Each structure stands twice: as structure tokens, then as C-alpha cells.
Ligand binder design. Structure first.
Ligand SMILES: CC(C)(C)C[C@@H](CO)Nc1ncnc2[nH]ccc12
Ligand SMILES: [Cl-]
Length: 167
């Protein structure tokens, strides 16, 4: 039993809700919140900009030190950093950005990072400003993640389409 509330159950392990991931994180304080990161951990917009703004830029400050030490992530890769005031940890996961010409096949590799964590609050990877089809992202999530994932979908209209079209 966990404190996630109001989710629709899609499969044994995947759950979905129309919600603002920032507000969800602030309410639940999950062990892991997933950020829709880029390889530079530059949190400018979309989910990343929103999560960073909610930390009063502390996520960006921590991320800049991480990159100075380690260099950029790989597309499809991840790193674990602090969750600041939102969660215990933030798993920064880089899905392919179609608007940069990146290989959509890397979306499965990106979701594999979730399997290193028993329970996660997450957005749909590569959706939104990353340019991929959110219906496809949900399918890859369901077919790749085996741990317990709680998906927050910001857009109510898209949420309804994802639910109604879910196989
Ligand atoms: C179409 C969507 C907006 C659902 C695309 C999604 C991509 O992951 N973005 C987000 N998802 C959940 N909470 C969020 N808060 C701020 C941005 C954001
Ligand atoms: Cl977005």
C-alpha cells in the first residue's frame, strides 16, 4: 500500500492520472520523481523547467555541478540526484527528443532506467516538447517498466485520449 490517490490502473504495475507532476510530488513526497531531462541537465521548460522552478533553482545548481564533474548523460541514460523539496530522489531520465532528430528506439532504453526503482512518480518520456507521440510513449512504458510506475499526464484532453485508446 502507498499514498498515491485517484489513479486509474492500466496494468499490474502501471497507473495513470491527469495531474500536474509538481503538485503531485509536493503532495505525495515520493521516494523517486522522474524528470524529463536532457543530456546537459539544462532544466528550461516542460516537466524539467517546472520541477526546477518548484525547487527554487536548487535542482539546476546541483545539476550544473554534476555535469561539471561527470559530463553529459547519454540519450536513453539517467542519473540519480536529490529530490529537493519534491521527493527523496529525482531520477533524471533522457528520452529521445524527436525535435533534435534522435532515435525513437532509444525510448525503450530510457524507460529501462525505471526498473532500478521499486516505485516511481513519472511523466511520459519523450512526450510534450520532446516531440514524440504520447500514445506510443505509454505503450513503451507498459511494455518495458516492470516496477510500479505512477504516470502524471498534465493535459486533460490527452489523458482522456490515452485512456480511451489504451489496449
Ligand atoms: C502533454 C504533456 C503536457 C502531458 C507532456 C508531458 C511530457 O512529459 N509534460 C508534463 N507532464 C506532467 N506534468 C507536467 N508538468 C509540467 C509539464 C508536464
Ligand atoms: Cl512538456
Amino acid at each position: 500500500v502507498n499514498s498515491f490517490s485517484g489513479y486509474l490502473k492500466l496494468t499490474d504495475n502501471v497507473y495513470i492520472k491527469n495531474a500536474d507532476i509538481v503538485e503531485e510530488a509536493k503532495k505525495v513526497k515520493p521516494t523517486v520523481v522522474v524528470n524529463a531531462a536532457n543530456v546537459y541537465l539544462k532544466h528550461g521548460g516542460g516537466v524539467a523547467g517546472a520541477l526546477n522552478k518548484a525547487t527554487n533553482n536548487a535542482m539546476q545548481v546541483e545539476s550544473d555541478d554534476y555535469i561539471a564533474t561527470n559530463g553529459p548523460l547519454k540519450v536513453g541514460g539517467s542519473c540519480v540526484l536529490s529530490g529537493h523539496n519534491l521527493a527523496k530522489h529525482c531520477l533524471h531520465v533522457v528520452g529521445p527528443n524527436v525535435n533534435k532528430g534522435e532515435d525513437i528506439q532509444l525510448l525503450k532504453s530510457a524507460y529501462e532506467n525505471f526498473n532500478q526503482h521499486e516505485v516511481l512518480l513519472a511523466p511520459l518520456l519523450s512526450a510534450g516538447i520532446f516531440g514524440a507521440d504520447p500514445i506510443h510513449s505509454l505503450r513503451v512504458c507498459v511494455d518495458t517498466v516492470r516496477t510500479n510506475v505512477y504516470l502524471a499526464v498534465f493535459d486533460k484532453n490527452l489523458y482522456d485520449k490515452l485512456v480511451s485508446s489504451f489496449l
